[PDB]
């Protein structure tokens, strides 16, 4: 054993030992309890970033911990390979997206290997290989013939200068983000998952996920947005019927979740596209401009609530079916066509959005709910105005004194008796649009035939292979310009036909990859029956916050679809969720000769407090998430090159709890490294003073007080570490506990025969308690202390007798 810790001299050997023993290559072995620990697989962008290293170290700790506790652990790794960055890199570097992607996979796989993650690499998948995406094409065709996938016209944002479609997040003030050209609203046929057929199941089955964070479930519930409400029809006044036809000339239909407040409605609001808006706008240019602006907006969903609410009166009136009030119709930008009837009633006194709308336009506010003796102020919103539980009806004639549910049913009865309304359930959930006008994604397995229509590709002819000899040029998406790809024959009649050229939303690949890991070479289905039955559901899922709502929702949807096809037996894919925190770092800049700032990467400055560009000073600025926005990313490879993998893993687990933001710290990295030196020196000094002995075990009566206190600390530490790994998932406090154990060890005389046995017991436990965090140095130190295989000695046991104190 060398005297000094040299991670370059031990980390390759340790990795080769694990690979040779194949501890991470797992099969469907019913002789051992399974554990499926899954970390969100990476986009092969070119090289790991610090977020990757944090995510997969957290996954590795949990995996290695459960391995030491006797579990058959599958910890798989793969590549979420489709998407825009490969296209972007192709347009910049004149290379093919596939070539760029596979070179990135090869480099990043090496980096992951160098960190010593206990990964079953025989289960590696790459979603851009046809051996993978053929199976989501297969699922598509099966759902398409059932109508769960369907074709329908939808509206997209066309950038005529870049010749491509943009999401609302890539549209700024109505113009494309990169071009600055005004976008054009185009209606084109696209494909959709009928996810709304599964809304009730996707909402109710959340109750099964006892170990999910409550706010993640809450966000799933809000996104599905089930409401139980009331359809209410407002007769159109005789003076307001010009230009209307059909049912729109008889009544205005709305949906409301507060029909108990129908006596307090003071006006109604319709979408820009509602026929009442069209008819009223016919001879009013101000309404035509307002309708045109609503149609031209590109507000993303995540920003819909923060959009300023605006309306225009129409001079058209409708009649409240309960009290006969004539109410004016307004056109408003927050009423969306397609959401229910595209029309709502407004009760400003008891709905805060209506309150602020009415207060802006000085529309009337009518109180119809009372909560105790609380004063109602028509000029100031109070939280109790919206209270649905403790309120009682007022100013409602026949309905006064009723609570929410009784007034709900009485209004239901009144309306139904008049033919003017009925109860109704609605969902905010929209169907899932999967068509993308992009090249580097999974082809959609549809052929368009003028005689046969939209025809699914037969299972025998899957995959529809995406050609990889393609370099996108930025003058439109390549597939629509490649007749050698889209020109084909109809699989139903043999006549001339054309393949669909749109590709699939890349969320599809990540909605089932965790099943594919169970049998990644299986050629007869998405996943083999034996492997799905054994592995079941993911026991632990570790990932980030970005896109989590949709990804979780989509993966739960796909599970229910795959279960209904007889491919899996679980209703839910993920039993536990750990969302890791972002990694943040300081930023640095120098001012421009053009009134702006040039952002400097931390690897290109030296800190004297103050900074200098590698030699004039730079400005040290604020701390924020590492990104290319302000060029403050720290390269994990330089951290590995300078200190080794264990230092990297230890710093990330020590610096903050996994869900907390982790602040980059040079001194913290160095502190992590010095601790590894300490751990190395402690074992080396123990073994230089007499060589290893048998670890103390059994009855400790007759041990000195100081050695009993060390064994108390020892088995108290083991209990704490076990609860931190297995229950709290708080690895930083577990590292500190082992540090406190080593401190007590340092202050304890262990030179006696019983002392050496306790010391051996202390060090044998500590190296095993830390093996999930820093396995290379711990594997190396364990073999100097004990001849058994560490993974067969297993997780350290708590000696409860070491914790019982001597009575008085
Ligand atoms: Mg349960
Ligand atoms: Zn045909």
Numbering used by the authors: 1 to 608, 616 to 621, 624 to 817
Give the published text:
To capture the different enzymatic states of the first catalytic step of LeuRS, crystals of the N. gonorrhoeae apoenzyme were soaked with Leu, ATP, ATP and l-leucinol, ATP and Leu. As has been previously recognized, the active site of NgLeuRS is large (approximately 758 Å3 in the apo form), which is necessary for association of the various substrates. In the apo state, the synthetic site of NgLeuRS is fully open allowing the entry of all substrates. Comparison of the NgLeuRS apo structure to that of the NgLeuRS·ATP·leucinol ternary complex shows that the CP1 hairpin (residues 147–194) together with a structurally associated α-helix (residues 84–93) rotates 31° toward the active site pushing the editing domain (residues 225–427) 29° away from the same region. Intriguingly, careful examination of the different X-ray structures shows the presence of a peptide-plane flip between L550 and H551 in the NgLeuRS·ATP·leucinol complex, that is absent in the apo and the intermediate bound structures.
To correctly aminoacylate tRNALeu, leucyl-tRNA synthetase (LeuRS) catalyzes three reactions: activation of leucine by ATP to form leucyl-adenylate (Leu-AMP), transfer of this amino acid to tRNALeu and post-transfer editing of any mischarged product. Mechanistically similar to other adenylate-forming enzymes, the class Ia aminoacyl-tRNA synthetase (aaRS) LeuRS charges tRNALeu isoacceptors, which are essential substrates for protein translation. We have solved crystal structures for all enzymatic states of Neisseria gonorrhoeae LeuRS during Leu-AMP formation.
